[PDB]
Ligand binder design. Sequence first.
Ligand SMILES: Nc1nc2c(ncn2[C@H]2C[C@H](O)[C@@H](COP(=O)(O)NP(=O)(O)OP(=O)(O)O)O2)c(=O)[nH]1
Ligand SMILES: [Mg+2]
Ligand SMILES: [Mg+2]
Length: 430
Amino acid sequence: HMATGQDRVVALVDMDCFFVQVEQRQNPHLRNKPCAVVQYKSWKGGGIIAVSYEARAFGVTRSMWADDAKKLCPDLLLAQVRESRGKANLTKYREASVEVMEIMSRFAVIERASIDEAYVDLTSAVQERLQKLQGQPISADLLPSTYIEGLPQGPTETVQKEGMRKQGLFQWLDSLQIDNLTSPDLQLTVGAVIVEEMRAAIERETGFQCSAGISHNKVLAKLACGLNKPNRQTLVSHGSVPQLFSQMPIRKIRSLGGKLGASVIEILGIEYMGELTQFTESQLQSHFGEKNGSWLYAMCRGIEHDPVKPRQLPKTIGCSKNFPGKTALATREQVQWWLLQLAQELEERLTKDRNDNDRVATQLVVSIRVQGDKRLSSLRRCCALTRYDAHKMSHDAFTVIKNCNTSGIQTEWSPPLTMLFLCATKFSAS
DNA sequence: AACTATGACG
DNA sequence: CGTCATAA
Ligand SMILES: Nc1nc2c(ncn2[C@H]2C[C@H](O)[C@@H](COP(=O)(O)NP(=O)(O)OP(=O)(O)O)O2)c(=O)[nH]1
Ligand SMILES: [Mg+2]
Ligand SMILES: [Mg+2]
């Protein structure tokens, strides 16, 4: 079924207001209330990085200053991200993420895509389940939180959302050919049943709720996941794609949210994903390149082949700190102190990684930014990471960046640094 | 003065 | 290898 891109069953599971749930689980007083997670509190009340659905009802969003959020939502409750060594420490959320990833890993191969989401390749699990209870009809009861995108439709409770969900689910299940084990639609349905079980396990064992998308590829699975958030899952069939894409803004598709998506819209003079079908593969390749052109040609038809990579661990482990405006580091001692702070956090995380995952990083990347520099990185350099020693890593990091200081004065450092980034990479087994 | 992963290109 | 893109 590869020709039509119906060869696999892929899901994307994403936690609902993740950081907030983590804080709510720990502090019961925050449950079922407009709440948000904030980083730092000194500048404009701190930056919001997560928002409960109750808070979103007031217009509160990520990236908003807490002071501004309070203007929209006076009774907004806030949880502060932990600070260690003068910077944000996200260990609590990383540990919570592990809880969830470990549960998902029981059901199938997963690809960690973020701190709060992972792709699941359910093709094999579906096949196994299909042979079990073969020929047995699938009850609506097995899909208590599933939406079938595009349904209900046609002539024939619906004014309310749950009623709408049920009607669509009934139409879908009624039309399913259960006797053909090879049917893509049947395979998606079975995948949805498994995902219901996965999400139940996650909630029962962690207390966290999540949403999911089930489809034939990662892009459609990700898109589907967001259609009925929170605490719901959505199945997007191959057949639902034409109508779904007909009014779907191009920027909403994974990897098209940036410049490429903007160029597709501007160069082609179109707004929705579906409009891409009128162009030949060659035409798209001419405008956007061989790889991008082929990808777009297939994608607008609901077809994509990016595999769910069997990777549950990060390929890099890093620490970074910004020093905006007048806080830019202007002294040798300051720069050295901050490098040590980052190096110490990095050392802790690395040591844990080595113990937990039987591997060691072999390269240390040092990135900095100087004030007045438009570029994200004024300098990027590497050196060998031979030992998990904060002092050595900090000293080595300083050695590689020290020549960027142009100040004659011994004490002073210029131009001022607005960012420091230490990253461990090139992991090897041990 | 948003703050603290992966992948493709050349 | 370093940069730029995309992103939660
Ligand atoms: N520091 C920082 N953290 C972020 C940012 N974006 C997301 N996070 C962190 C905080 C988030 O809680 C977590 C998950 O990211 P999502 O899945 O994108 N959002 P959530 O789960 O919150 O809500 P829902 O999915 O229901 O819409 O990652 C950011 O720009 N900056
Ligand atoms: Mg989420
Ligand atoms: Mg997410």
